[PDB]
Amino acid sequence: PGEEEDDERGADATWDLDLLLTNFSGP
Amino acid sequence: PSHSGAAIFEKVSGIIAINEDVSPAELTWRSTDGDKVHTVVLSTIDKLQATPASSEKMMLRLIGKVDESKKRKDNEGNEVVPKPQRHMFSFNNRTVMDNIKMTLQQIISRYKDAD
Secondary structure (H helix, E strand, O other): OOOOOOOOOOOOOOOOOOOOOOOOOOO | OOOOEEEEEOOEEEEEEEEOOOOOOEEEEEEOOOOOEEEEOOOOOOEEEEOOOOOOOOEEEEEOOOOHHHOOOOOOOOOOOOOOOEEEEEOOOHHHHHHHHHHHHHHHHHHHOOO
């Protein structure tokens, strides 16, 4: 790997925008 | 102008469509040249994340469910929920993704609030 994508630049920024609704219980 | 959109998986492109006609509002993916179709039931999906502003990589990620109740200990007296099956969808459309994620995402928080 080296000159690829979708797993280094085009696939590593969605791990910081969601994860905050009503999952994993809570209220 | 919603639900239906384009997405790619395992280097295989296809069209991604959400179905809010059945009980578990689910969505299925169908390739154009890959001759394949992946039906992802939003029901079985508990997580949903799209790539906005900070992430201009235009991609939607949806994870199944998690049941630690069936976990398993270890020699270190430690345990954890069985590694589920996550799915990272990625397309070359930032406009589309944000359009389908907004409709498919809400359903999660909406469903989780009852399911």
